[PDB]
């Protein structure tokens, strides 16, 4: 797998692995049992002559021909611990989420769905929270919650809100969230946010169509008056 001549070879981790140095300047860590390159380190831009290891390869030193030393330290256990934790947190975020939805704690459910990026749950928190809101804008807690979002999150909502608007049955929620954003954010700050304008561009033509509709529904409602004037005679 080495592009050029391999010129230093030393076993690490007792029998399990091998580290090799090529004239290309690439350090390849191989599995002796399987004979496969597990990892490749590129810390040099020239040939390598020397290779020193310490504590079964826990520490590795490589001296470039130019004169550059790369002090490599083992951190596998450090990484897997990190992988374990984020997976642990992600599972908890899931578990906390569906429980809140069953309980109806929409204000907390909303924030979790921000982090986990779950569009159906988002639409479900917002949809049935609106139904309760029917029963200032949504509810004081959620109205405060929507205000605190960082600009990364604000872009995320309006991407979804752009999507819900295009459909004529889910637009009522869409203009609906957009209103509350304009209530609880500095309209100036919204403008500078990169890429927001283009999302903000696509939202009008669908809303304006929704003005042309609904407004017509008012027109053909007054049949009830025309019914109501005739009967009175």
């Amino acid at each position: 797998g080495h592009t050029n001549a391999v010129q230093r070879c030393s076993f690490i981790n007792k029998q399990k692995q091998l580290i090799s140095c090529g004239a290309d300047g690439l350090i390849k860590i191989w599995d002796c049992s399987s004979g496969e390159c597990l990892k490749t380190l590129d810390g040099h831009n020239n040939r390598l002559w020397a290779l020193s290891t310490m504590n079964d390869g826990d520490m590795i030193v490589s001296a470039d021909a130019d004169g550059v030393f790369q002090f490599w330290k083992d951190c596998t256990e450090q990484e897997i611990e990190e992988e374990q934790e984020k997976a642990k947190l992600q599972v908890e975020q899931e578990q906390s989420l569906q429980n809140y939805m069953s309980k109806g704690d929409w204000t907390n459910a909303f924030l979790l769905a921000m982090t986990l990026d779950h569009p159906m749950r988002l639409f479900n928190v917002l949809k049935r929270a609106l139904g309760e809101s029917r029963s200032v804008i949504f509810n004081e807690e959620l109205d405060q919650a929507i205000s605190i979002l960082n600009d990364e999150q604000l872009i995320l909502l309006m991407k979804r809100c752009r999507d819900w608007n295009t459909n004529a049955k889910t637009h009522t929620i869409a203009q609906r969230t957009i209103r509350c954003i304009l209530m609880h954010h500095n309209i100036a700050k919204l403008s500078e946010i990169p890429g927001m304008v283009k999302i903000v561009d696509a939202i009008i033509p669908y809303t304006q169509r929704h003005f042309t509709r609904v407004d017509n529904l008012v027109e053909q409602s007054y049949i009830l008056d025309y019914a109501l004037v005739e009967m009175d005679k």
Binding site: G131, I187, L190, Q208, V218, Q220, S221, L228, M231
Partner: protein, 817 residues
């Protein structure tokens, strides 16, 4: 033709399932493939055998292999036994009546665990399909299913009605609320699979694939939105293999607690839970040691937390078995001694007794008290033969030779031998000859119960095949040294007569019933026929793609059958060596084929665990026998032909003995039902001052509204035109009632607009005609809120268009050239 049925089954002590111990050392219940066996530990004899019925080979019998028992659970108080099968079927058995009581079918895969509730009225079942189903024995129904898990259920804990803890192969721990049918908490047990789960009070233990073992506290009443399950620490067991099962047992007299971790290897590791006073004493002591070593106080506290596991658990003793262990269970707990019973993968039961005093056991190793060994063979039988009297069955397996009585099914004698390959009776049924893989030839006598003669150098390699002449005076043996050797019986000892060296290794050697022909199979996929009298070459059979494994010659020495690993049986005419027909009999390698005596019919066995009955003249499969759970290594036929015996990789020896409304019309019903309810409640309220709706659990308003939704959009207008004006008035009353439920109003505002308003259009003339005051107030009402509800939408969306236009405008000023 006549039909063959499985007359009997034996040779299996403990199959791939758990073991259930019942007090009287007491009796033990173990699985025997599709059947369950009840054993007496003291005597080692089978007490009773549970069989559902429907013996294999019958017309009513299913043409698929029987489902083998996967888990056994018995409620001691009710003496009710539940059997879990690989197909996901639970059968409730009456131990006294030894009959099936109930049959539950709710799982699509093998059942992994069964557990009776404390009261014994409900059965919770976990299966490999990742589902938990709670059954009601009195109701004979499945109450509910818990489906959050995404892999096989390895273990679960439910001692209380309120809560359940479940573990799965995907490695999550899940706490359930049985009243809500929902998962409350989810935690990752281990990096990979989680296999063991045991619970004692707050103390909980789980095992992963590696030696890591996790220790948790269970505060069911914590109720903090989390933390019902919190990790304490990790302890490493000696065995690197996975821990399959964990269970607890407590001593009533001393309140002492013990448990083991059943490993996938031949090791069971027992542990003791230290008492609280011991933990404090140890904690103070180790603090003194750490302080003496000079560690800082904060370091000591962290070290104590790191060593939290050591304080609670104490490695007590390790049990080592010669064979891999399949399942284990506590039998008795006492101050004097601790007793355990286990089943191995090698088909035997082992009873272990551990005498102990205080912290540590008295003996270095556990005491093996009882073993049930006589009625089973550890290694799979490679060859079988039936005595001429058809009374004794010889079974040769690696390491041992066992012989059974066909009538009683009980082993008579056992002989220790090498890696057995081929065995045959001698005439008279008093002697048996064995050919081993080491090239040794062994001879035994039943009466002497000992080995008379052994020929170490009979062959340089494995004696693969062995056959005898009809007279019984000349013996033929085939081996991997590429030679056939003839031997004579002289008074009894064997003398080598002649050597026939072949070009290739020999797989099978057969002698014709008339002793005129000798057929030998070679690895080169060719079968060579010789004349026994003169050893002159006769014929070279060709056409098998893989080597021929078995050869059999008809009673008349006319037809010869060859079965090879290429899944084909070839019938040849011995007169000219012509293949009359080639049959694709089985889906895998065919090991043995035998003619029925005095007939051209024959049987065949293959690795597919199927035995097939064939017609030698019509070349058709008469019957298919599906009883074997695994590969069928040997087959033998009685001299009379009355019965056939087959043994397989499942250690089982069995004997086969010859014996509508449309859109609108649906709406009219909906308005009638819902408004009848609405009017009744209105009348009922005024005076104070159905089954369908209850079944659907919806209000009258939702029910009709849902019916409106189901109508396709192209079909709404025609449905509504069909409506008579009388139903319009009910429709208007309905819409009015919807108005109060403003939640429903905004949910389906566009639809209410379209349907209401056409209705006014279509029959405007009739509507205006009436003078009804109550109708006049309804129309006024529905109008007003419809405007406000609609105007609310327009205001909110007519709003957002404007300021966003300002937002668009502001960006242009700043960022537009």
């Amino acid at each position: 033709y006549q039909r063959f049925e499985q007359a009997a089954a034996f040779g299996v002590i403990a199959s791939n399932a758990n073991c259930v111990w019942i007090p009287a050392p007491g009796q033990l219940i173990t699985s025997a493939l599709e059947d369950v066996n009840i054993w007496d530990i003291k005597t080692g004899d089978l007490v009773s055998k549970l069989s559902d019925g429907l013996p294999p080979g019958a017309s009513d019998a299913r043409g698929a292999k029987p489902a083998e028992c996967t888990y056994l659970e018995a409620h001691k108080d009710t003496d009710l036994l539940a059997v879990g099968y690989a197909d996901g079927v639970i059968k409730v058995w009456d131990l006294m009546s030894k009959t099936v009581l109930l049959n539950f079918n709710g799982h699509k895969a093998a059942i992994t665990l069964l557990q009776f509730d404390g009261t014994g009225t409900r059965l919770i079942s976990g299966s490999k399909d990742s589902n938990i189903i709670v059954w009601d024995l009195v109701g004979e129904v499945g109450l509910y299913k818990l489906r959050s898990h995404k892999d096989s259920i390895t273990g679960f804990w439910c001692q209380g009605e309120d809560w359940l803890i479940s573990t799965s192969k995907d490695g999550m721990i899940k706490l359930w609320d049985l009243k809500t049918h929902q998962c409350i908490e989810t935690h990752i047990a281990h990096t990979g699979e989680c296999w063991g789960l045991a619970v004692k009070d707050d103390l909980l233990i789980t095992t992963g694939t590696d030696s890591q073992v996790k220790i948790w506290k269970l505060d069911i009443e914590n109720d903090k939105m989390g933390g019902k399950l919190t990790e304490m620490g990790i302890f490493e067991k000696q065995s690197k293999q996975r821990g399959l099962k964990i269970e607890f047992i407590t001593n009533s007299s001393d309140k002492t607690s013990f448990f083991y971790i059943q490993n996938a290897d031949k090791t069971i590791e027992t542990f003791r839970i230290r008492k609280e006073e011991e933990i404090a004493r140890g904690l103070k002591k180790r603090e003194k040691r750490l302080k003496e070593k000079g560690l800082t106080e904060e370091e000591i506290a962290k070290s104590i937390k790191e060593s939290y596991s050591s304080f609670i658990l104490h490695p007590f003793q390790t049990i080592r078995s010669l064979y891999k262990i399949k399942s284990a269970s506590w039998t008795t707990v006492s101050s004097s001694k601790l007793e355990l019973v286990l089943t191995t993968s090698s088909n035997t039961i082992e009873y272990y007794s551990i005498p102990y005093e205080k912290r540590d056991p008295t003996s270095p190793a556990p005491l093996k008290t009882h073993t049930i060994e006589l009625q089973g063979q550890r290694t799979d039988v490679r060859s079988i033969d039936i005595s001429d009297d058809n009374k004794l069955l010889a079974t040769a397996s690696n390491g041992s030779l066992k012989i059974w009585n066909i009538k009683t099914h009980k082993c008579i004698r056992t002989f220790e031998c090498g890696y057995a390959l081929t065995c045959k009776f001698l005439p008279g049924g008093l002697l048996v000859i064995l050919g081993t893989r080491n090239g040794e030839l062994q001879l035994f006598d039943l009466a002497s119960s000992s080995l008379l003669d052994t020929i170490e150098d009979a062959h340089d390699a494995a004696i693969w095949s062995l056959d005898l002449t009809s007279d019984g005076k000349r013996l033929v043996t085939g081996s991997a040294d590429k030679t056939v050797k003839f031997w004579d019986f002289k008074v009894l000892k064997l003398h080598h007569d002649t050597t026939l060296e072949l070009t290739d290794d020999i797989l099978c050697v057969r002698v014709s019933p008339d002793d005129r022909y000798l057929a030998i199979s070679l690895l080169d996929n060719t079968v060579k026929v010789f004349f026994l009298d003169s050893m002159k070459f006769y014929l070279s059979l060709y056409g098998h793609k893989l080597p021929v494994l078995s050869i059999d010659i008809s009673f008349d020495s006319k037809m010869i059958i060859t079965s090879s690993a290429d899944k084909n049986i070839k019938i040849w005419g011995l007169d000219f060596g012509d293949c009359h027909k080639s049959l694709f009999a089985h889906q895998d390698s065919i090991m043995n084929v035998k003619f029925l005596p005095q007939s051209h019919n024959f049987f065949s066995c293959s690795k597919d665990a199927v035995v097939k009955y064939w017609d030698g003249e019509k070349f058709e499969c008469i019957q298919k026998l599906y009883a074997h759970q695994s590969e069928v290594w040997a087959l033998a036929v009685a001299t009379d032909g009355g019965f056939v015996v087959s043994s397989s990789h499942d250690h089982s020896i069995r004997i086969w003995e010859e014996t509508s409304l449309k859109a609108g019309e649906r709406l009219m019903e909906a308005l009638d039902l819902g408004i009848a309810e609405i009017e009744g409640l209105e009348a009922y309220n005024r005076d104070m001052k159905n089954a369908v709706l209850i079944a659907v659990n919806k209000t009258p308003e939702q029910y009709i509204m849902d019916t409106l939704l189901r109508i396709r959009m192209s079909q709404l207008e025609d449905a509504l035109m069909v409506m008579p004006f009388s139903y319009v008035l009910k429709f208007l009353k309905f819409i009015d009632t919807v108005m109060q439920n403003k939640t429903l109003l905004h949910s389906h505002l566009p639809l209410i607009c379209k349907n209401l308003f056409f209705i006014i259009k279509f029959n405007h003339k009739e509507l205006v005609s009436q003078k009804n005051e109550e109708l006049k107030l309804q129309i006024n009402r529905v109008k007003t809120e419809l405007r406000s509800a609609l105007k609310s939408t327009e205001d909110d969306l007519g709003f957002n268009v404007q300021g966003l236009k300002f937002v668009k405008q502001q960006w242009n000023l700043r960022h537009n050239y």
